[PDB]
Subunit: 349 residues, 3 copies
């Protein structure tokens, strides 16, 4: 099953008392096949309460998605600063080469992020430059003679004041309090699909979401209730990177052997990733409340074609005389069978 | 000769009494060189009268070109349906992941298509998903427990009504009759070039052809009469995939050894493909009436520079004192020689 | 040091009494890493006074930058001609597949160009087609029977008048005199940065520079005075191809081993090229007056973040309580240290 990236394919870049940063394997490492996803990666970020992710710049456009917790993200330009209050379901673009830091101002609740990483330098090449003091503070890379001229300060002072502590450090109540375009929330609009059985929330390329147009990207939240099914469908255009945010379930992804059809099975678990390539029929069942985050690559004009249920059911659209010829049953047996599923998009499993 | 793809490089995907579908080799298989054409393929489609190409979706934008015959193409969205009457010289975009079917409603005449295939999933990766009942009907890939919940019908009935016949099947007079943006025809406008000897019809990127802008594509029809020559020229920007639709002839494509100049020769025949990379001078002669279809990749601002004849002759544009220095003859000998070819674009061979 | 392409990595395509044309190695040859620069090359052009670069077309968009001298560039369309007066600091797009020739009309001063080459046919594949008479005049590639029909002239005359001299030939005072959108000069606007120590001139993607938007490109001129330093900075988005036009100096480019930080050192000399990938901190010192030309790939919204000096200093933008936590010193020691460098962008070394 090449479409399944289990949670352990997340390489820990950094772990301590206060949080962890994990990067998912290059999609195009294990097999070719995702040569079109070669310039995307996922990062999981988790931080304990009253913590700060210290000044760093990454050589990638990032789309942040907050799964849990509350953050102040501060983004620096050369001559300017902007900070954004981040909530559950908030997404924002953290552009390439922006020095930024990330406060978890909540008192009890962990901050959990997933980032879509779009590198700028080499397809999928994740590069991070640490301004603050680590083993890897980049300012230390400059020779003494460059620093001394650069800062017009004696090296010894540059060393004592700027140069010589982990990457996510505790911040105190006084520092939090003293710290004091916009995020688009997946849920501050009516869900696209909503049902006793599930809901799908989606922000897609439209004027209104100019950044999603430019990156040609959708961010979906899919909820499947215990014992429900996301009814079979394919995306017309989009390649969906599905991260399992919470819950367990199972997934039937139909592709080819890679003209024969192969069903590709995956147990689903927190932190697991599945690629659903465009046009690949997929069915999803939750054994507990399942919360999926989807990044839809090549999103413009994407279109969920369901193969059962009343809405968004492309089979319904087949003219009757062609229905007669495409399936073994009569028009009346086919139209009746298709009416037996009263639900749309989601349903009992 | 790496630029010549003979008709036999078409792999038959499907053949029966009623029609055939053929896919051309990956351009970038035999040699690197066409690394820029790696995400295009050609498909030849032929179907007997009163036939239907049953519901299928392909994971590629397709540009259909009708060479012969007449079709009703029906295109399905999740909640909508559209059918288009297709004629000789009609082109239309059949977008990725659209379930569609294709009727040949003519009584006597075969329907002949060429498709440009722009895959969505892997460069040049042709993927087709069969909704109707074949060996490869994709609905069969789902486990019993998913289908039964999905359709809310007992598996046995799903099997009898939907699941369990070729890919192009006969349709009857009653079914045809009962079956009852837009296509852009290459010829419903004045041909770009027209002459006793040949004609070139062309739709190019302009506002008016928004789809050709977006795909950055031209579709040309080139006719060369028995005993005529398409006068030497190069395209400034475009990479031309030339399919021989009917007739025989010969082609001199000048490139490099791959600073030396190599003449690349090809006998030309129905179903043969030649790549003319940008800036590569080309001359074409018909031994019978030659009908070429050209797909022009990277089309925006393309520009046919002829090297002989009165119009579109870049040599004419050389200022005289530079003419003196660029060619061995005098200004008067050069301007006179260039006047000896009264014809433009096409001429006697 | 993979980022340093010494002047000798320029392959001479053509040399004689009258000038030379040189092409830089494929960036992506020696190492992967510049897989994003794979479709750019640099060409150095030098020509003696009263010389013409004879009719040729290249299968690449070219951005010409005049470092020295004065030229008349004549650009041919099929039905039209345009010539541009070119001066020190003038840049112009010479589009793919345009037959063009280049006069040095100055009497004493050599014409010196650098071209950015964006090939159209194969990533980085430099292809040149010589219309005028060389070993490699492309018109000679056509068989006798094609030329005779093509020009409607006996081959012997085609041979004597058009076919059968170097690539850059002397032109006479009478021919120069007789020879008789627009160029954008780097300096016909206030320099972006200007100082006792250096200046940076820059044309970037904005409406006004539609061609730089379309190619997504900046052209910079950077001057560093003897004994001055270009203060440490990174570009947020842009990948900078830096050509040393005149002078000597030294460069500290900080990257990774390819999480550790490596300082990448280079002596700098006329004709040397350094790639500064996005987000890679860089410091530059001149030992003589240093004149750099930079082509900035992926330029849109690029942003020079300085790490010292008063303007464009991203460290300044860190809120004080986070300054406390990111560097070992106190707020007061850090803000004071950052004030010690009064200069901006450039400074004494």
């Amino acid at each position: 099953n090449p479409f399944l990236f289990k949670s352990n394919k997340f390489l820990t870049l950094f772990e301590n008392e206060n949080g962890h940063i994990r990067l998912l394997q290059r999609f195009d490492k294990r097999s070719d096949l995702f040569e079109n996803l070669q310039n995307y990666r996922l990062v999981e970020y988790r931080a304990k309460p009253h913590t700060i992710f210290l000044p760093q710049h990454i050589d990638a456009d990032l789309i942040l998605v907050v799964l849990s917790g509350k953050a102040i993200l501060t983004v620096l330009s050369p001559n300017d600063r902007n900070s954004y209050n981040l909530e559950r379901g908030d997404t924002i673009k953290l552009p390439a080469g922006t020095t930024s830091y990330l406060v978890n101002q909540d008192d009890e609740e962990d901050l959990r992020l997933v980032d879509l990483v779009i590198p700028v330098n080499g397809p999928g090449k994740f590069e991070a430059f640490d301004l603050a003091k680590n083993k890897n503070q980049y300012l230390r890379g400059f020779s003494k003679n460059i620093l001394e001229a650069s800062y017009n300060t004696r090296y010894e002072t540059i060393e004592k004041v700027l140069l010589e502590t982990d990457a996510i450090v505790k911040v105190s109540r006084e520092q939090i309090e003293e710290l004091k375009f916009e995020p688009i929330n997946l849920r501050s609009h009516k869900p696209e699909y909503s049902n006793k059985f599930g809901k799908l929330f989606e922000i897609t390329p439209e004027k209104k979401y100019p950044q999603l147009q430019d990156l040609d990207l959708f961010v979906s939240c899919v909820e499947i209730n215990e014992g429900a099914l996301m009814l079979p469908h394919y995306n017309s255009r989009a390649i969906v990177v599905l991260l399992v945010n919470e819950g367990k379930g199972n997934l039937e992804l139909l592709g080819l052997k890679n003209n024969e059809v192969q069903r590709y099975e995956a147990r689903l678990s927190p932190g697991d990733v599945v690629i659903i390539p465009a046009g690949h029929p997929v069915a999803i069942t939750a054994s507990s409340n399942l919360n999926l985050l989807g990044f839809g690559i090549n999103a413009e004009n994407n279109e969920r074609n369901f193969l059962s249920g009343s809405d968004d059911n492309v089979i319904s659209q087949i003219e009757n005389p062609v229905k007669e010829l495409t399936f073994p049953g009569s028009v009346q047996e086919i139209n009746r069978l298709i009416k037996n599923q009263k639900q749309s998009h989601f349903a009992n499993a």
